[PDB]
Design a protein around this ligand. Structure first.
Ligand code: HEM
Ligand SMILES: [K+]
Length: 248
């Protein structure tokens, strides 16, 4: 149900050039996972009932970076500031979401469709909307479903974003990568979740909750068996996530 706004030709030209520049920058800096986390934490605050929060540029605000769920993301924001400055026409909202999309692409992931025109909004959402890694399926549904308005399928596919990167004991407290290949976007997050705890790889309780829920488990299996299917459903869910509250 989207109606995307019209942006000028200059704005579109800027999108295209920023996209390229973000590829090169994110690849060199090895920071795709962090950039994915930044985009996801920007969008993930959306509350459908109130139409508050969501991917509207507020994560750049020190007040939103201070939320405990956002530990470390001040790094991401600082990393992007000089590039963003080359693209003054673009909203921060658009820029961060583009960086999330590129993160996925340059690590070998699907091409998530991108539509410009998000406006930067002045008020960060209240803290406490992003998910708690120590909780389970009900909580996931409360956050992704009742707040954001995404689907059960979307929940499992987006969990797959842990296919890249790692936790840090100084940020969340959790530590290490979910996968043996943490800068490669693939279905390894699901294959590892399926094979049990292997030494040196991370599983959050929230990842584990996928295995015991009657709706989530068949999806984990599908994605572990079929990376093409994971990529399709991941791209659908990321696009939706990046557009929460935008163009409705
Ligand atoms: C489903 C509920 C989720 C929970 C409970 C959760 C929790 C976490 C936690 C605790 C970390 C560790 C942060 C650190 O210590 O550095 C993390 C990292 C990460 N998360 Fe999630 N997350 C979830 C969903 C997602 C989603 C939906 C995405 C994107 C589609 C995502 C992408 C990432 C990425 C890429 C990292 C690694 C960041 C890095 O390498 O610095 N997460 N997540
Ligand atoms: K991987």
């Amino acid at each position: 149900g989207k109606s995307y706004p019209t942006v000028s030709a200059d704005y579109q030209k800027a999108v295209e050039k920023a996209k390229k520049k973000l590829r090169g920058f994110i690849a060199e800096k090895r920071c795709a996972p962090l950039m994915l986390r930044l985009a996801w934490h920007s969008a993930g605050t959306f509350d459908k009932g109130t139409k508050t929060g969501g991917p509207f540029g507020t994560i750049k605000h020190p007040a939103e970076l201070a939320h405990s769920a956002n530990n470390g993301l001040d790094i991401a924001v600082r990393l992007l500031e000089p590039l963003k400055a080359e693209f003054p026409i673009l909203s921060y909202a658009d820029f961060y979401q583009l960086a999330g999309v590129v993160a996925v692409e340059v690590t070998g992931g699907p091409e998530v469709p991108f539509h410009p025109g998000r406006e930067d909004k002045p008020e960060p959402p209240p803290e406490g909307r992003l998910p708690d890694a120590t909780k389970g399926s009900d909580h996931l549904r409360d956050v992704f479903g009742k707040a954001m308005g995404l689907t059960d399928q979307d929940i499992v596919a987006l969990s797959g974003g842990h296919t890249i990167g790692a936790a840090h004991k100084e940020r969340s407290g959790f530590e290490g990568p979910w996968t043996s290949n943490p800068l490669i976007f693939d279905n390894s997050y699901f294959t590892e979740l399926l094979s049990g705890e292997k030494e040196g790889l991370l599983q959050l309780p929230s990842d584990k909750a996928l295995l015991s829920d009657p709706v989530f488990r068949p999806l984990v299996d599908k994605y572990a068996a079929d990376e093409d299917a994971f990529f399709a459903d991941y791209a659908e869910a990321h696009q939706k996530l990046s557009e929460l509250g935008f163009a409705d």
